Design a protein around this ligand. Sequence first.
Ligand SMILES: Nc1nc2c(ncn2[C@@H]2O[C@H](COP(=O)(O)O)[C@@H](O)[C@H]2O)c(=O)[nH]1
Ligand SMILES: Nc1nc2c(ncn2[C@@H]2O[C@H](COP(=O)(O)O)[C@@H](O)[C@H]2O)c(=O)[nH]1
Lengths: 198, 197
Amino acid sequence: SGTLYIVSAPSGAGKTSLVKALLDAAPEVRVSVSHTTRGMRPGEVDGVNYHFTSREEFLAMLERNEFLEHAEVFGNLYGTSQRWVEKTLAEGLDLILEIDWQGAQQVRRLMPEAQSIFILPPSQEALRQRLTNSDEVIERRMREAVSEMSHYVEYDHLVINDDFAHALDDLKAIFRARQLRQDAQQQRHAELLGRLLA
Amino acid sequence: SGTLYIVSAPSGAGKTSLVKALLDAAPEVRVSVSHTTRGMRPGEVDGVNYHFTSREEFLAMLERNEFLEHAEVFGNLYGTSQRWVEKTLAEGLDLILEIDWQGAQQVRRLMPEAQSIFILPPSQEALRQRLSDEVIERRMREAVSEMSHYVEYDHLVINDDFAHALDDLKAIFRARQLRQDAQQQRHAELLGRLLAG
Ligand SMILES: Nc1nc2c(ncn2[C@@H]2O[C@H](COP(=O)(O)O)[C@@H](O)[C@H]2O)c(=O)[nH]1
Ligand SMILES: Nc1nc2c(ncn2[C@@H]2O[C@H](COP(=O)(O)O)[C@@H](O)[C@H]2O)c(=O)[nH]1
């Protein structure tokens, strides 16, 4: 079966260009499309950026136990649907959940073999620029981002996004090393290992 | 302090070209020079490939508890001197022990924070070349016989294509430096600034 990767970053900027770039260079890796109850933004496509749904429909899915994890982020509900994750892993494909620290905690309990990565800004100034890209609102968004970053200690690996080219290669190294671990290689090269041992 | 890496292969696939190439691209990483009692081979230099010594002197060193690990391989004795390992790690340098599965077990027992990598051939045919025609068969039988110890290693690298295997090794070393503990030490000041309110 495939490997599950959790990738988290401060939520105020949206999903990271780093993960998009990683997926562009490794088309065999899949990414989960989350459900959300927030409204669509210009340039977003239902079924691609998110499965956009209603709060009533989101809660009904929760009652039907369809979410691997869910969380409230800035008052809107987000979640990872479980069936798609199980299907993709069972096909032997690796996949990424780009989710916040709350969802990461839930996933780790259910899947202790999951690799998790937190992507950090190089400075508060750089984080603030990404958020501003109203002043009063900005400081609250910064305080909320700081509270999320405090959870970086819960993650297996950390990437400091100082130089985009360097951070992308750092992500690639984490993913490649994960696939070289004993557990993944034993399954991947099962037939080879049998020939080496017989 | 530095990280200790154990790099192993089936017994007889000696000090690998892969590790040398990795060291060329990793100037902060050192490699331990092993002691051996086998005779020098053409092109080998005492103090570089090995510390070549006698069996009686090897046993005297063993009696003085100077070896972190030691093992018999094809009837010859090999070992890692402990003082150099401790000094190198305490200087903050990473280091590689290129040793067999027996030495790996001893090092894991004494230093559970050590990380380990097993380098696998793509086939038995490929292993045979790397290993007298009779001498080749004795090395092949021993290497195949103890192949199962790959399961004890943290990562596995298939040495099919040299460049691909080298990139695999590099990714393992880089991922270790991206681990929570290494990054917390590297970015302590930054992390404190990010969390300060
Ligand atoms: N737990 C959880 N968090 C999510 C999920 N999808 C997105 N998020 C988080 O919600 C944040 C806000 O996303 P945005 O509204 O900008 O698209 C993201 O930065 C990410 O941290 C999800 O399925 N589960
Ligand atoms: N335990 C242990 N094995 C070693 C050491 N140095 C070399 N070896 C093993 O001895 C094998 C034979 O090496 P060679 O004699 O061809 O140079 C190597 O493939 C490696 O498995 C050492 O210091 N300790």
